Amino acid sequence: LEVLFQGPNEFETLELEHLLWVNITQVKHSIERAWTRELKSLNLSTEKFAILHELMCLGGESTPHTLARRIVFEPHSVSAIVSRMEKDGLIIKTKDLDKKHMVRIKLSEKAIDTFYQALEISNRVYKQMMASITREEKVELSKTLTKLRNHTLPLTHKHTKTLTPFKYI
Amino acid sequence: LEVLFQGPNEFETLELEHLLWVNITQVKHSIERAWTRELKSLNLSTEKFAILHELMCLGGESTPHTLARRIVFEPHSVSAIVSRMEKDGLIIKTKDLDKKHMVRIKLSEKAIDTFYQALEISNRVYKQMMASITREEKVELSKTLTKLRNHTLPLTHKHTKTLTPFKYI
């Protein structure tokens, strides 16, 4: 005999758009926790891997402002992450010879070799994580998420980002 | 005349599963930045709103271990967020009368009234953010993201979570 007055209340039924935000949050946390443990032996968080990857796309050297433009994160966050990486020996900062006050940021050989290793592990980890959804589901998920990013990024980022135009296939 | 040797390199073409992780990350950051600015006048981060919401589903009072079980975040994070909320006057912690060392956590009247306000603003914000995708796209996005959460959460959370079974419609 089911007990009375103990079933879910009205706050467990959400607008679909709110449930989508819960879903996005839960998958981002679930996948990050699993990937971060597999990458532990290289001491990479997801943000340090993202910054290594963007600098690889830039030919291994750039400036803080160009890297910030290319990546979704806030610039103060980009700067904090780069400073952590500098202390890990992954990034070398040098004074630009021309512009007083401008910094150039360059990946070390150690960091490029770490990225070698981390990209191969990372690709295996994302594939095994997403093996439960089909190619077509993956294709439509990227299209829908891309529509959402294109609609929402300009609400707070007004010409400040020119995100790296990643391709697949 | 297009300059030579300056086009994207091979690190800009990703495995689809890696591009999906970039997409998830970018939408989570884009939507959070926009929602957090609209909710500023109530001094809520997304995590404090999530904890207020889960405690509302629990009838406004619970214990740290039950709240942790119901929410995706790590328990040390849940605890840090609850302590911040206690300092904001949103949560009252009391010693359980029976169990030595057990804490009960209860929302204050101020917090329930804040949640009133925040839920109504939040629902408007998520709707306007997601107005670019159709009902059917929203429905399929929740189904795909739910498959991904169900496959990936058990890789690191082994019977430690019993996430709140949110419904829509």
Ligand SMILES: Oc1ccc(Cl)cc1Cl
């Ligand atoms: O590889 C990446 C580049 C950028 C971002 Cl935001 C995430 C990842 Cl994994």
Ligand SMILES: Oc1ccc(Cl)cc1Cl
């Ligand atoms: O309302 C919520 C409940 C849980 C989580 Cl993880 C996110 C939100 Cl918005």
